[model samples]
Structures are given as C-alpha cells and as structure tokens.
Target: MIPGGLSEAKPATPEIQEIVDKVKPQLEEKTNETYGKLEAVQYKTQVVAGTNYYIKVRAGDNKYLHLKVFKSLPGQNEDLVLTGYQVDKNKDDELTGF
Candidate 1:
C-alpha cells in the first residue's frame, strides 16, 4: 500500500455507500444540485491525516459523479466531510483523489 496515495479502485461496499449517504447533503449543497437516487458504484481510498474515500456514484441515467470524502481517524471525533468532487464522470473512469 502506498501511504498518502490512492489505492486501486474496488467495488463499492455497504459501508462506503453509507458514508456517501452521510455526505450527500453537503455534496448537494456545495454543488447546488440534488440527486433523487445516488448509488455508489466504485471507490478508492487515499491515506492522509484522515482517509479520503474517492467514490463513483450513479446520480441518474448516465449521470455520474466522483466524490472525495474525508473520514477522520478514529478518536478524532470528526464527522465525514465532503472535501472535493467531480461531475459528468463515467463508469469506466478511474477514481482519483483530489
């Protein structure tokens, strides 16, 4: 594993999906868009002060978004934060950290 670098993409898990759900509100507020149905399709992670979950989400039909979320290390008492994002992504696109 490369510390501070992005890991290879992996199929999205329920835990990652839940993390995305938790930050959806923040993501929408920041992007000024709302998704009726957001599904996590793939993901990658980068190690840092906290971990960053780079998630590929299916927003709607052919609408995809890459979300960068920060999950603080345990015991830090920090909430998951949406740090960055990219829109108009595709299923084949590589998940990269910002």
Candidate 2:
C-alpha cells in the first residue's frame, strides 16, 4: 500500500488514472501520515508513538491500508516510548489518490 491511502498498484483504466492524477496532489499534501525512523545498534529497534501512522482507506466497497516503518532505540530490547498521543483528527485525516 502507498502512504496516504493510495494503492501501490497502477490503475487499471484511463478513467481510474485520471481520478488518481486529480487526487494525487491532495494526497501528496497530507502530513503526519507516517512517522518513525530506523535506528540500529546492538539490535534493530523501531519506535512509533504517533497514530494514523497506519491508516485504513475505503474506496467504494474496498479498503486499502498501509503499514508504518518503525525502528527501535539503541541497546533496548523493547521499543521506546517518546511521547503519548491523543486522537489527532487534524493530522490523522487525509484523502488522497484512488
């Protein structure tokens, strides 16, 4: 899946492609849709503290979802929590390509 609720797959028809092109800008304008970076030390670690990093988007009757990339802190067996989160309707909500 692509970020901001877009499919990695190409559109099957020109009509779909046009819709994708039209929506692409709005989708690209979205922010905070994904967070977290890779950190490697003794072991690989992934830290994700934000919501909507993983989002589910429904198009018609079908739904598309994307997974966020995460990295763990150095020398930590478990993932680290940097901050607590609340529902970020402003940031979490995004509508992009088809």
Candidate 3:
C-alpha cells in the first residue's frame, strides 16, 4: 500500500517546527484564496538585507517560495506575514532556498 523499505519521512526539527508553527497559519488565513493547496515538506528561516525575520518551505515537488516576517513597534498576530528571502540547504541548514 506504500513505499516499502522506507521506514518514514524525516520529520522537521525544533527550529523548523517552531518557525512553521508561526508561519503555516498565516498562509492558511491569507493566501488560501490565491493558491490551490500548500503541502509543506519542510520549513527554514532566513536573514535578508541585514534583517533576519524570514522563512520558507520545501514543497513535495522541490519547489521554493519564501517570505519575510516583520515586527511592528507593537506586534503580535500582525508581526507575522509572507514577504521575501534566501537560504543554504548545504550549510547548517539553518538557511535554504525559497
């Protein structure tokens, strides 16, 4: 019924899990209307143009798409949203593509 010999897919780490927890919901709320469906394989954060509040996902098809997160002087739910960025899948994996 499934791929044999493969025990399981690698699960995300505390860092990625943490970021996805913050990011996934915002995608659901805002972008749901535009995109078809997002099947996230993994998520990694990034630092762009001196700022570091960024994140992106690895999709089932190995496609890349990223966004930027901002924190207003008074931020919370509004502090999170899809914006822009980059990554290094080879390095600590702390950063990858988008």
Candidate 4:
C-alpha cells in the first residue's frame, strides 16, 4: 500500500500493513458508494468529558462520524454508550488522490 494506506503511515509491522492493505480497499469501496467517492478517509481523536477513546472519521464530503467508548453510569463497565456524527468547514480541506 502507498502512504495512502490507512493509518496514514508506514505501518509499524507486517501485521499492521497486512491489515491496512486488506481493509483500506474494502473501506474505500464502501465509502465510495455510500459517501460519494472519498478523496481520503482521515481519522482523528477528540477529548470530551474526561474521556480518551473517542474516534472521529472525516468523510470526503466534509462530514464526520464520531464514536466514543466510555463507561456507562458512574464507571460501571458494562455497555458503554455508543454515539454519533458531525463535521467541518468547507474552504480547502478536501483531500485528493486517496
């Protein structure tokens, strides 16, 4: 995979690269149909209410899908609340050749 590969990186290990190589194409195919031909799928993290496991995905349409895995009800570890999508400004953030 090119650096265009998922993880935006030179995967640290062969296992990691294998995963990206396998997954990125599937992801791209799905998103291309669903989200309208993504230029790239960018991932980032955001912090909220003292939690560190929030995941945000930037779609090529300049929209986002956000998910957070956190404790439910005063740190009880049973079923964390799963969540939503939000997004961006439209100036020049679009990606290319992803």
Model 1 segments more than 4 A misplaced: 1-7, 18-38, 72-80, 86-98
Error of 1 at 22 (Å): 6.4
Residue-level lDDT tens digits of model 2 in 1-98: 53332343222234332332243323322322343111100111233332212222212111121223233444553663423121222332334444
lDDT of each residue in 31-79, candidate 1, tens digit only: 3335443555467777776776666654444445566777866568577
Q: What is the TM-score of each candidate against the true structure?
A: 0.46, 0.21, 0.29, 0.31
Per-model tally of clashing residue pairs: 0, 5, 8, 0
Query: What's every prediction's RMSD, in angstroms?
Result: 7.7, 15.3, 12.4, 9.5
Q: Which residue pairs clash within candidate 3?
A: 64-98, 65-98, 67-84, 68-83, 68-84, 87-96, 88-95, 88-96
Give stretches of model 4 more than 4 Å off. Answer: 1-52, 71-73, 85-98
Candidate 3 TM-score, true structure as reference: 0.29
Q: Candidate 3: worst 10 consecutive residues by lDDT? A: 2-11
Residue 74, candidate 1: Cα error in Å is 12
- Candidate 4 per-residue lDDT, tens place, 1-98, comes to 32222443221234322322343334324334454433233332334443434333333454323233343544555555545323323332334323
lDDT of each: 0.54, 0.27, 0.36, 0.35
